Design a protein around this ligand. Structure first.
Ligand code: URC
Ligand code: URC
Ligand code: URC
Ligand code: URC
Ligand code: CL
Ligand code: CL
Ligand code: CL
Ligand code: CL
Ligand code: NA
Ligand code: NA
Ligand code: NA
Ligand code: NA
Lengths: 295, 295, 295, 295
């Protein structure tokens, strides 16, 4: 036997950082969950009980905190890049660092119409994420995403004209509910290293904003032919707006809301045009994916 | 043996309702999870395999949908009261109905600065809940709450002057982070029945708003001596503002954010006044509760 | 305003303990999650920012670990009683301690047909729990339970003869699946204090065993008329077998498994006697409860 | 823009099947969660609102139930292969089917020392899974796994001799707790199609058994130098025992159990050789991975 692939490190590292403007009194908080997994000439830790080649996962954990202390933690693409670069540079025998960051929302509170200097609210479980692969000799590969963005529209969703055969029961509809949890990922052009990432720093927050904005507007305004057609419109607009991204991926569940026939009860009419009360279905769910690039 | 207590019914009933203004095109959605448990002369279903006294939980489920079809689902205190009243009136041998409702947020989207007529976003897992106990001969007992409201303040929290003995290691602090998940409950004066509930309908949304507002403002503005002292200030203000509530309950976890001593590494200073990077603790957590009434 | 009720302390305290037989080499592990909430003359911590009366929740946490170090952690009824007794005795102004313990399973592994001396497997998320209320002047009130015991029987469950009216759609059935998550609680006679608890120590593991055994056997062997009738048979047998318990409570979801009509497809027969493939329903679910005591 | 990748279908399809021996009265149950995602000439559903090429996810759902009705659902490698093969054969323009199956445990109950004919218990959340990729023209790629197998050993785990530098605080230890959630995957040799899968059917249950057995025995008996070294021993034995598998992957969290220094309290000794009470850590956790193949 032989080791074909190996990576190890520390997962679920919770991190908070605060910035305090002693001038204005305004504080700003950041909270994330970090995973760092290393690759390199480590196969003998597996095959020969050779721990000498292991940078302890506890030490990886310390390094995450120390790096947060000494560097910006925003945007997460930058923090991820600094952290991964540290491991491959610091340790000769480590040749890749895989950095995953989940950013948790802490939105400044408005109290009586004015932003509060140090109080925050978690306005949803929507996350901003990065996946940063720092590979010695091959630069920095970054995937950015938003996830957990849950939306619903009550009309202007349709689903008709699909294939019909002996396995098909679904009725065509020209007016349905559409609800999903948006998972959207934009893949950056390969960066040659930390310097190139630094040179593009303002583009990270901006592209996240754009992706978020395009998603919400297209969802709200598209009179949707299908989840497939709607998600494609989102991806093409994001690509059009950021030349440094190579692909946009969407993964969308179709979280079904079923009509409830109540005509068996006093002839109550609750279907089609009379549909008022629906049963949200927890499972099963459609799952629709696509990766869009440029022609 | 004998049955000392019994209740049965349907839990986790997911319900959606839409309202459509055909005049304006504006749609409004409501989504909830409902539980209805009945009590009454049902002990022989347990002791004698006498199913004749059972209103099927499947029928309870149907009844929830039918009631949503034929009545307002807002405010949830009213819907809960109508639903519970239905069971005790419809079935002679049913003498109490216990209605729990969790309301899920669907906040209208703003697209390019304007509210969209039929698109919504789940802006957090914060819930609005009710517990409605409809008891034949003894009216309607309503508990209203907000839960899952997650907040953090980065300063203006303190914890010193607590009891110190041989079990105490905790250092006194005059400046810490405070973060919690707010669970707040206001208990209404007993209502004599559905008519009395109806007579107070506008007070339900208003008192929820007040509770929410008082919570957020007191959290943001109190230079907190402890979770105990802060939560009491919230409760007393809510009581002061709604004479029809008898008590206000808070249940607050203290979600700890620990300083990280980094002085072992290149003498980095990250404690006290230099504290920038913290480790959020998933567990354990303080849990602080109180029920406040009027003197 | 005034404080009507108050309790505070530390929740989600994870605890492991190991016992090592240096003679035999056999080790035994225990793992739990503990919550301790105190009551007493603490209202001024809420109303007057008077922290002097607060035994820090961090100190409560320390005390849980120290108590585990110096006392048996099994049975959990005893450990809970020692822990609660400690707080009301140690602190004059603390008058009740509320101790909740969740015990996690670590079952010794058998390797090649022989029990291993120090390796364990989590054979399910079923828990053994206690709720121990230690109230100064009023002894120790103990509720013991098993929860998360998930079972299914594929036949010998029936549900017919229930009330039928205009809200009823459910078909009567003489052969269905029954599946539940068993939550069963036995309430002990009040104990006067820690000494009385000590005097009954062997009865705790034994009564848990009995409850577990009666549950599984009655579930497997009862040709069930309903969840109600089956659960009552469990409770009455447990009561018959332990005079020191006053009541037995069951809370059982009916986790529905629906037939799937496939006759629309090539006349496939998959209902009634031909029913082979079913759709397990995640929600809604029946929820059936009863508290049984002696006549 | 252009579609670079696309797949769509139905996720979280819960399925139960029962087998009844009318001769013996013995029933056997199977329960799973299924996801089927299709690929093919479907890009115009995304780019042109062309639903004609969509096999409805609702129809995919029906097909899963119908396939379960008409075929064995065990072993899951076979069921997955039949299901995926169906889509690529039935639909000319569908060229791959991705079938993920999670199998839930329903272990026959023993009642008074004898196996019960139709009653079952969920003896843990451990799963048996498959990932079956059916690709037209390129056969069937199968990955089998066990996951959620949670174990602990109380001694005979060590971790010393690892790299020490200015980021290292962790003390070397020659006796620690080791606990993990085992995720183990064996990758089968490519199969040319459904016939080849059929020809190996008995090897699926057998290799799952072997993997399970090797995991538990190696965990219990290895005096572990590290998670890395232990997991490698598991993988090499599995490979040695099934020539038709090409690689074995492990993904293991190191679920840390920390010593608790209690010497600050009455000089209590609870570290090193005196270590009895530990604090299980929910996060962070080590995460150790490797993919082992043959030399
Ligand atoms: O937008 C949809 N896409 C599908 O592929 C599909 N399939 C289905 O049943 N409903 C829908 N809806
Ligand atoms: O606000 C607090 N209340 C307490 O009761 C307590 N106890 C503790 O350890 N920290 C805190 N903080
Ligand atoms: O055992 C049952 N009890 C009920 O009360 C009930 N109600 C229902 O719809 N199914 C069942 N099954
Ligand atoms: O078995 C281990 N492997 C590691 O790589 C590691 N790192 C760490 O901190 N503890 C351990 N333990
Ligand atoms: Cl779908
Ligand atoms: Cl606290
Ligand atoms: Cl039921
Ligand atoms: Cl580790
Ligand atoms: Na390197
Ligand atoms: Na009645
Ligand atoms: Na006392
Ligand atoms: Na095909």
């Amino acid at each position: 036997s032989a080791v074909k692939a190996a990576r190890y490190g520390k997962d679920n590292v919770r991190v908070y950082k605060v910035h305090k403007d002693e001038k204005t009194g305004v504080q700003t908080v950041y909270e994330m969950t970090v995973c760092v997994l290393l690759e390199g000439e480590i196969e003998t830790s597996y095959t020969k009980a050779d721990n000498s080649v292991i940078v302890a996962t506890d030490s990886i954990k310390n390094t995450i905190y120390i790096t947060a202390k000494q560097n910006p933690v925003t945007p997460p693409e930058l923090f991820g890049s600094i952290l991964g670069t540290h491991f491959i540079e610091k340790y000769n025998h480590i040749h890749a660092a895989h950095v995953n960051i989940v950013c948790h929302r802490w939105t400044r509170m408005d109290i009586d119409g004015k932003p509060h200097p140090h109080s925050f609210i978690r306005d949803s479980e929507e996350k901003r994420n990065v996946q940063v692969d720092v590979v010695e000799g091959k630069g920095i590969d970054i995937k950015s995403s938003l996830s957990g963005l849950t939306v619903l529209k009550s009309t202007n969703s349709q689903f008709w004209g699909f294939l019909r055969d002996e396995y098909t029961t679904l009725k065509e509809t020209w007016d349905r509910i559409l609800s999903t949890d948006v998972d959207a990922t934009w893949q950056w052009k390969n960066f040659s290293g930390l310097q190139e990432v630094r040179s593009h720093v303002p583009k990270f927050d901006a592209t996240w904003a754009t992706a978020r904005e395009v998603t919400l507007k297209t969802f709200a305004e598209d009179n949707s032919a299908s989840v497939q057609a709607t998600m494609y419109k989102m991806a093409e607009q994001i690509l059009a707006r950021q030349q440094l991204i190579e692909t946009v991926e969407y993964s969308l569940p179709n979280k079904h809301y079923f009509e409830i026939d109540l005509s068996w009860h006093k002839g109550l009419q609750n279907t089609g045009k009379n549909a008022e009360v629906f049963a949200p279905q927890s499972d099963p769910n459609g799952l629709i994916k696509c990766t869009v690039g440029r022609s």
